[PDB]
Amino acid sequence: QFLRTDDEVVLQCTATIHKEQQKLCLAAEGFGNRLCFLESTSVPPDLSICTFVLEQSLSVRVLQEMLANTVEHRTLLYGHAILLRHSYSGMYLCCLSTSLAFDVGLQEDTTGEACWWTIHPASKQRSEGEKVRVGDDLILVSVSSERYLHLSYGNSSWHVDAAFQQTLWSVAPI
C-alpha cells in the first residue's frame, strides 16, 4: 500500500524519555487556541481531532510556479509538497510566524507557502520521485521556513514545533 491524496491519516511519532517509550499523535481542536498538540496512544483517547486528509501533493517546482504566478487520488512521492487538512476544523496544518523553533498550528488560507510541507525519507538515500509506502517513516519540512516538523519536550510534556532538528513521523491511514 501507498499513500494517496484524499487519504485520511494520523501523524504519529515515537517519544522516549527516561527509557519510557510511547507513540504520540498530532492533534488540534476546532476552535480557540490554534496550536497543535500531542496525544499518547493505547489508538488515541480522542481520535477525531487527530484526523488529517492528504489534500494535495505537488512538486515544489509546480507549487512555487503556482504562487509566483499570483504575484502582481494521486500517489505521494518523495520530495513533493503536501497540504494536510484537519478533518474536524476544516483548516490546515501550518508553520506559524511565532515562537529558535516556530509554532505549528491551523489556519484557513492555503495560498502561501506556510501550509505546505515537503516529504523526505528517514534514510540517507534521498529517494526523490519514489512512491511513499505505508510503513515508511517521513521527515516533513516546512516550505515557508525550511524548519522540520519536530517533537519537543518541555518541563513535563511533549510538544510539536518547527525546528532546526528532524523528527521521524509515521503517516498511517485510518
Task: Characterize the structure shown.
With 174 residues, the protein is mainly β. It has a single domain, classed as Trefoil (Acidic Fibroblast Growth Factor, subunit A) (Trefoil). The chain is 5% helix and 43% strand. A 6-stranded antiparallel barrel has the order 1-4-5-8-9-12. Strands 6-7-11-10 form a 4-stranded antiparallel sheet, with no helix packed on it. The chain is globular. The two termini are 13 Å apart. The relative contact order is 0.22. It is found in: Sarcoplasmic reticulum membrane. Belongs to the ryanodine receptor (TC 1.A.3.1) family. RYR2 subfamily. This is Ryanodine receptor 2. Residues 73-122, 129-174 form the MIR domain.
N-to-C SSE string, H for helix and E for strand:
EEEEHEEEEEEEE
Helical element count? Answer: 1
Query: If you consult CATH, what is the topology?
Result: Trefoil (Acidic Fibroblast Growth Factor, subunit A)
Class based on secondary structure composition and strand pairing: mainly beta
Strand arrangement across the biggest beta sheet: 1-4-5-8-9-12
β-strand percent reads 35-45%
CATH architecture annotation name:
Trefoil
Based on CA atoms alone, the radius of gyration comes out at: 15 Å
CATH C-level label: Mainly Beta
Q: N- to C-terminal separation?
A: 13 Å
Estimate percent helicity.
under 10%
Overall geometry: globular
Summed up, the domain count is 1
Largest sheet composition: 6 strands, antiparallel, barrel
Tally of strands: 12
